[PDB]
Amino acid sequence: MATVQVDIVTPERKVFQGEADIVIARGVEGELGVMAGHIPLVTPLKTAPVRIKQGDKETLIAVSGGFLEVRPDKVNILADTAELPEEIDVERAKKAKARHETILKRLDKTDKDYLRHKRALERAEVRLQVANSKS
Amino acid sequence: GMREIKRRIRSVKNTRQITKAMKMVAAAKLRRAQETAENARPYADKISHPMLEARPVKKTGYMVITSDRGLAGPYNANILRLVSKTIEERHQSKDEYVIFAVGRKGRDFFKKRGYPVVEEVTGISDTPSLTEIQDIAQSAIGMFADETFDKLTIFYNEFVSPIVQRPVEKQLLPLTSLLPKYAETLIYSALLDAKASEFGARMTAMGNATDNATEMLETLTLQFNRA
């Protein structure tokens, strides 16, 4: 059992610093399970959880953006709004479950909000689904 | 000469009370900002365009930053002073520039003397966190992104010392030496710098303020006794 850093970091401050045993992530054109010994690898990510294991303690993570960055050693993703397994406020997501979900059915015709509030129906589902994993 | 020169005295006293207690905060608050600033650096660092490549040259957009709820000496009246001197030569046209007025003190300026203003970001915040200008930022970009902007720009109140801070105007969207989140964070960079500077500028005016009260008081006091 070796080790390799996987530091997801929001524009503001760092997020997960600790060394990662084995990593997983869901990219746009597949699934990237971050590890050690990779080649340079960069491509747009999804709003997916990157449960960055640090002691076999597993937990989903809230992410929605950021680009990829891979080497033979390190991995840093510049994701947008992201937070810890406990900083995920379940109640702030209980609002989008009555703010964005209960309005995505009004206006249509021209493309619009199926991808400015349903993509948001991913951040508004991550803060409820990932909201489980707090341990 | 034995009544309302003591009113002048007590009032000047009170003013003295608060300018120093707000001098305390100007540095309480706007040093924290420095933390919530040099933190950006990290992500501020990880580094023909969508079009954010040098193009010409018609309607340009400004983004002038100022304190809302200000009490910071000149550092707010000399950045308006500068948008209203530099646009004086860039206005022989009625394109009318358009400014994104952040901060309420610059806001009001711009709606007294027509300018006009296509956006006025409500209430600054002193953190200022993540969800705060990802509108005016995002939409100040959005106006270069197709395409009513051939160039963006902030009027930044750049931070040298806490004793000084200089009116500066940078250019944002037409870059220099899919991924324009750079622009959005650039606006962080200034919005964040613009903060320090304000309170940087605020305690400096508050010390000076305190002092000026003391002094002035010590003038007034001669009248308290000698008719």
Coordinates of C-alpha atoms in Angstrom, one line a residue:
Chain A
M1 CA 0.0 0.0 0.0
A2 CA 1.6 3.2 -1.3
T3 CA 0.0 6.6 -1.4
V4 CA -0.7 9.7 -3.6
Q5 CA -2.2 13.1 -2.9
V6 CA -5.6 14.1 -4.2
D7 CA -6.4 17.7 -3.2
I8 CA -9.7 18.9 -4.5
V9 CA -9.8 22.6 -3.8
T10 CA -12.4 25.3 -4.3
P11 CA -11.3 28.7 -5.5
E12 CA -11.5 29.9 -1.9
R13 CA -9.6 27.4 0.2
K14 CA -8.4 23.8 0.1
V15 CA -10.8 20.9 0.7
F16 CA -9.4 17.4 1.1
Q17 CA -5.6 17.5 1.7
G18 CA -4.9 14.1 3.3
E19 CA -3.2 11.3 1.3
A20 CA -5.6 9.1 -0.6
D21 CA -5.6 5.3 -0.7
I22 CA -7.8 4.8 -3.7
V23 CA -9.9 7.4 -5.5
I24 CA -13.0 7.5 -7.7
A25 CA -14.7 10.1 -9.9
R26 CA -17.3 10.5 -12.6
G27 CA -16.1 12.4 -15.7
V28 CA -18.0 13.6 -18.7
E29 CA -16.7 10.9 -21.1
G30 CA -16.5 8.1 -18.5
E31 CA -15.4 7.3 -14.9
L32 CA -12.0 8.4 -13.6
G33 CA -10.8 6.4 -10.6
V34 CA -7.8 8.5 -9.6
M35 CA -4.8 6.6 -8.4
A36 CA -1.0 6.6 -8.7
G37 CA 1.3 6.3 -11.8
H38 CA -1.1 8.0 -14.2
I39 CA -0.1 10.0 -17.3
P40 CA -1.0 13.7 -17.8
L41 CA -4.8 13.7 -17.9
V42 CA -7.1 16.7 -18.3
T43 CA -10.8 17.1 -19.2
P44 CA -14.1 18.6 -18.0
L45 CA -15.6 16.8 -15.0
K46 CA -19.2 16.4 -13.9
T47 CA -21.2 17.5 -10.8
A48 CA -20.0 14.1 -9.4
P49 CA -18.8 13.0 -6.0
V50 CA -15.1 12.3 -5.7
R51 CA -15.1 10.2 -2.5
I52 CA -11.5 10.8 -1.7
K53 CA -10.6 8.0 0.6
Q54 CA -8.2 8.7 3.5
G55 CA -8.1 5.7 5.8
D56 CA -10.8 3.6 4.0
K57 CA -13.3 6.0 5.5
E58 CA -15.6 6.4 2.5
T59 CA -18.1 9.2 1.9
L60 CA -19.6 11.0 -1.1
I61 CA -18.5 14.5 -1.9
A62 CA -20.4 17.5 -3.2
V63 CA -19.0 19.0 -6.3
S64 CA -20.3 20.8 -9.4
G65 CA -17.7 22.1 -11.8
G66 CA -13.9 22.4 -12.0
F67 CA -11.4 21.0 -14.4
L68 CA -9.1 18.0 -14.3
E69 CA -5.3 17.7 -13.6
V70 CA -3.4 14.4 -13.6
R71 CA 0.2 13.4 -13.5
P72 CA 2.5 10.4 -12.6
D73 CA 2.1 11.7 -9.0
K74 CA -0.4 14.5 -8.0
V75 CA -4.0 15.3 -8.7
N76 CA -5.7 18.7 -8.1
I77 CA -9.2 19.5 -9.4
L78 CA -10.4 23.1 -9.4
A79 CA -14.0 22.4 -8.8
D80 CA -16.6 25.1 -8.2
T81 CA -18.9 24.9 -5.3
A82 CA -17.7 22.0 -3.2
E83 CA -17.7 21.0 0.5
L84 CA -17.0 18.4 3.1
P85 CA -19.1 15.3 3.9
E86 CA -20.6 17.3 6.8
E87 CA -20.5 20.8 5.4
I88 CA -23.2 19.7 3.0
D89 CA -26.2 21.5 4.5
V90 CA -29.2 19.1 4.1
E91 CA -31.6 22.0 4.9
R92 CA -30.2 24.3 2.2
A93 CA -31.0 21.4 -0.2
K94 CA -34.5 21.1 1.3
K95 CA -35.2 24.5 -0.2
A96 CA -34.2 23.7 -3.8
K97 CA -36.5 20.7 -3.3
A98 CA -39.3 23.4 -3.3
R99 CA -37.6 26.3 -5.1
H100 CA -36.1 24.8 -8.3
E101 CA -38.1 21.5 -8.5
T102 CA -41.5 23.2 -8.1
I103 CA -40.8 25.8 -10.8
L104 CA -39.2 23.6 -13.5
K105 CA -42.5 23.1 -15.4
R106 CA -43.8 26.6 -15.9
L107 CA -42.2 28.4 -18.9
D108 CA -40.6 26.4 -21.7
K109 CA -40.3 26.9 -25.5
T110 CA -36.6 27.9 -26.2
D111 CA -34.1 25.7 -24.1
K112 CA -33.5 27.5 -21.0
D113 CA -33.8 26.0 -17.5
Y114 CA -33.7 22.2 -18.1
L115 CA -30.0 23.1 -17.9
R116 CA -30.0 26.0 -15.4
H117 CA -32.1 24.4 -12.7
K118 CA -32.1 20.7 -13.7
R119 CA -28.3 20.7 -13.7
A120 CA -29.2 22.5 -10.5
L121 CA -31.4 19.5 -9.8
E122 CA -28.1 17.7 -9.5
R123 CA -26.6 20.1 -7.0
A124 CA -30.0 20.1 -5.3
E125 CA -29.9 16.3 -5.2
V126 CA -26.3 16.0 -4.2
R127 CA -26.8 18.0 -1.1
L128 CA -29.5 15.5 -0.2
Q129 CA -28.0 12.2 -1.4
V130 CA -24.4 13.0 -0.5
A131 CA -26.0 14.6 2.6
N132 CA -26.3 11.0 3.9
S133 CA -22.5 10.3 3.9
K134 CA -21.3 12.5 6.8
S135 CA -19.1 9.8 8.4
Chain B
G1 CA -21.0 81.6 25.8
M2 CA -21.8 79.1 28.5
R3 CA -24.3 76.7 26.7
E4 CA -24.3 75.6 23.1
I5 CA -20.5 75.7 22.8
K6 CA -20.8 72.8 25.3
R7 CA -23.3 71.2 23.0
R8 CA -20.6 71.6 20.4
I9 CA -18.3 70.1 23.0
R10 CA -20.4 67.1 24.0
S11 CA -21.3 66.3 20.4
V12 CA -17.7 66.5 19.3
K13 CA -17.0 64.3 22.2
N14 CA -19.5 61.7 21.0
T15 CA -18.2 61.8 17.5
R16 CA -14.8 61.1 19.1
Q17 CA -16.5 58.2 20.8
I18 CA -17.4 56.5 17.6
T19 CA -14.7 57.3 15.1
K20 CA -12.2 55.5 17.3
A21 CA -14.5 52.6 18.0
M22 CA -14.9 52.3 14.2
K23 CA -11.2 52.8 13.8
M24 CA -11.0 49.6 15.8
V25 CA -13.2 47.8 13.4
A26 CA -11.8 49.2 10.2
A27 CA -8.7 47.2 11.2
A28 CA -10.7 44.4 12.9
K29 CA -12.7 43.9 9.7
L30 CA -10.4 45.0 6.9
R31 CA -7.4 42.8 7.8
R32 CA -9.6 39.7 8.0
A33 CA -10.3 40.6 4.3
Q34 CA -6.5 40.1 3.7
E35 CA -6.9 36.5 4.9
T36 CA -10.0 36.0 2.8
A37 CA -7.8 37.5 0.1
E38 CA -4.5 35.7 0.1
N39 CA -6.6 32.5 0.4
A40 CA -7.8 33.1 -3.2
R41 CA -4.1 33.1 -4.3
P42 CA -4.1 29.3 -4.2
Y43 CA -6.9 28.9 -6.8
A44 CA -6.0 32.4 -8.0
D45 CA -2.8 30.6 -9.0
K46 CA -3.7 27.3 -10.6
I47 CA -3.5 28.6 -14.1
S48 CA -8.0 32.8 -30.3
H49 CA -10.0 32.4 -27.0
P50 CA -13.7 32.0 -26.9
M51 CA -13.1 35.5 -28.2
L52 CA -11.4 36.9 -25.2
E53 CA -8.7 37.7 -27.7
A54 CA -7.9 41.3 -28.6
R55 CA -10.7 42.6 -30.8
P56 CA -12.0 46.1 -31.6
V57 CA -13.6 48.4 -30.4
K58 CA -17.1 49.8 -30.0
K59 CA -19.3 49.6 -26.9
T60 CA -17.2 49.1 -23.7
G61 CA -18.3 48.2 -20.2
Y62 CA -17.1 49.5 -16.9
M63 CA -17.3 47.9 -13.4
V64 CA -16.5 50.5 -10.8
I65 CA -16.0 49.3 -7.2
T66 CA -16.9 51.4 -4.2
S67 CA -17.8 51.1 -0.6
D68 CA -21.5 51.0 0.2
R69 CA -22.2 52.4 3.6
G70 CA -18.9 54.3 3.6
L71 CA -16.9 56.4 6.0
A72 CA -13.5 56.0 4.6
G73 CA -12.2 59.5 3.9
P74 CA -11.6 60.2 0.2
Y75 CA -11.1 56.6 -0.8
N76 CA -14.5 56.5 -2.6
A77 CA -14.7 60.1 -3.8
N78 CA -11.5 59.8 -5.6
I79 CA -12.3 56.7 -7.6
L80 CA -15.5 58.1 -8.7
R81 CA -13.3 61.2 -9.4
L82 CA -11.3 59.0 -11.7
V83 CA -14.0 57.2 -13.7
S84 CA -15.5 60.7 -14.1
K85 CA -12.2 62.0 -15.5
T86 CA -11.1 59.2 -17.7
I87 CA -14.5 58.7 -19.3
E88 CA -14.5 62.4 -20.0
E89 CA -12.2 61.4 -22.8
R90 CA -14.0 58.3 -24.1
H91 CA -17.4 59.9 -24.3
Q92 CA -17.4 62.1 -27.4
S93 CA -19.8 59.3 -28.2
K94 CA -23.2 58.6 -26.8
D95 CA -22.5 54.8 -26.6
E96 CA -22.7 55.9 -22.9
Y97 CA -20.2 53.4 -21.6
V98 CA -22.4 51.7 -19.1
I99 CA -21.0 50.8 -15.7
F100 CA -21.6 47.9 -13.3
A101 CA -21.9 49.8 -10.1
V102 CA -20.8 47.7 -7.2
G103 CA -21.1 49.3 -3.8
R104 CA -23.8 51.8 -2.9
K105 CA -21.7 54.9 -2.7
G106 CA -20.7 54.7 -6.3
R107 CA -24.1 53.5 -7.1
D108 CA -25.9 56.7 -6.1
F109 CA -23.3 58.9 -7.8
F110 CA -24.2 57.1 -11.0
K111 CA -27.9 57.6 -10.7
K112 CA -27.7 61.3 -9.8
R113 CA -25.5 62.3 -12.7
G114 CA -26.7 60.2 -15.7
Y115 CA -24.2 57.5 -16.8
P116 CA -26.2 55.4 -16.5
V117 CA -25.7 52.0 -15.0
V118 CA -26.9 48.7 -16.3
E119 CA -26.3 47.0 -12.9
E120 CA -26.1 48.0 -9.3
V121 CA -25.0 45.2 -6.9
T122 CA -27.0 45.6 -3.8
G123 CA -25.0 45.3 -0.5
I124 CA -21.3 44.4 -0.9
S125 CA -20.7 42.2 2.2
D126 CA -17.3 42.2 4.0
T127 CA -16.3 38.6 3.6
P128 CA -17.3 38.6 0.8
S129 CA -17.8 34.8 0.2
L130 CA -18.6 32.9 -2.9
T131 CA -22.2 33.9 -3.7
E132 CA -22.0 37.6 -4.0
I133 CA -21.0 38.9 -7.4
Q134 CA -21.1 35.7 -9.4
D135 CA -23.9 37.7 -10.9
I136 CA -22.5 41.1 -11.9
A137 CA -19.1 39.3 -12.5
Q138 CA -20.8 36.5 -14.3
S139 CA -23.1 38.9 -16.2
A140 CA -20.4 41.5 -16.8
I141 CA -18.6 38.6 -18.6
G142 CA -21.9 37.5 -20.1
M143 CA -22.1 40.8 -21.9
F144 CA -18.7 40.3 -23.5
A145 CA -19.8 36.7 -24.2
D146 CA -22.0 37.7 -27.1
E147 CA -21.2 40.5 -27.5
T148 CA -22.3 44.0 -26.4
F149 CA -18.9 44.4 -24.8
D150 CA -15.8 44.8 -26.8
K151 CA -13.9 45.3 -23.5
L152 CA -14.7 45.0 -19.8
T153 CA -12.9 46.9 -16.9
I154 CA -13.0 47.5 -13.1
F155 CA -12.2 50.6 -11.2
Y156 CA -10.6 48.7 -8.4
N157 CA -9.4 50.7 -5.4
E158 CA -6.0 49.1 -5.3
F159 CA -4.4 48.4 -1.9
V160 CA -0.8 49.6 -1.2
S161 CA -0.4 50.2 2.5
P162 CA -3.2 50.5 4.9
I163 CA -2.1 54.1 5.0
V164 CA -2.5 54.5 1.2
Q165 CA -4.5 52.9 -1.6
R166 CA -4.5 54.0 -5.3
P167 CA -7.4 54.4 -7.8
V168 CA -6.5 52.0 -10.4
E169 CA -8.3 50.7 -13.5
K170 CA -7.5 47.3 -14.8
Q171 CA -8.9 45.6 -17.9
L172 CA -10.5 42.2 -17.4
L173 CA -12.2 40.5 -20.3
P174 CA -9.8 41.2 -23.2
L175 CA -7.2 39.0 -21.7
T176 CA -3.4 39.4 -21.7
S177 CA -0.1 37.5 -21.1
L178 CA -14.7 27.2 -22.0
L179 CA -12.4 28.5 -19.2
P180 CA -13.2 32.2 -18.5
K181 CA -13.7 31.4 -14.8
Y182 CA -10.4 33.3 -14.9
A183 CA -12.3 36.5 -15.5
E184 CA -14.8 35.7 -12.8
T185 CA -12.0 35.2 -10.3
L186 CA -10.1 38.2 -11.5
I187 CA -13.2 40.1 -10.4
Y188 CA -12.8 38.3 -7.1
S189 CA -9.2 39.4 -7.0
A190 CA -10.3 43.0 -7.2
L191 CA -13.5 42.8 -5.3
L192 CA -11.4 41.3 -2.6
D193 CA -8.6 43.9 -3.0
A194 CA -11.2 46.6 -3.1
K195 CA -12.2 45.6 0.3
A196 CA -9.0 45.8 2.3
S197 CA -8.3 49.1 0.7
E198 CA -11.7 50.5 1.8
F199 CA -11.2 49.7 5.4
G200 CA -7.5 50.1 5.0
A201 CA -8.7 53.6 4.0
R202 CA -11.3 53.5 6.8
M203 CA -9.1 53.2 9.9
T204 CA -6.6 55.6 8.5
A205 CA -9.5 58.2 8.2
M206 CA -10.7 57.0 11.7
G207 CA -7.4 57.6 13.5
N208 CA -7.1 61.0 11.7
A209 CA -10.7 61.3 12.8
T210 CA -10.2 60.5 16.4
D211 CA -7.1 62.8 16.5
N212 CA -9.0 65.6 14.7
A213 CA -11.7 65.4 17.4
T214 CA -9.2 65.5 20.3
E215 CA -7.5 68.5 18.8
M216 CA -10.7 70.4 17.9
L217 CA -12.0 69.5 21.3
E218 CA -8.9 71.0 22.9
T219 CA -9.7 74.1 20.9
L220 CA -13.4 74.3 22.0
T221 CA -12.5 73.8 25.7
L222 CA -11.0 77.3 26.0
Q223 CA -14.5 78.6 25.4
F224 CA -15.9 76.3 28.1
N225 CA -14.4 78.5 30.8
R226 CA -13.1 81.9 29.6
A227 CA -16.1 84.2 28.6

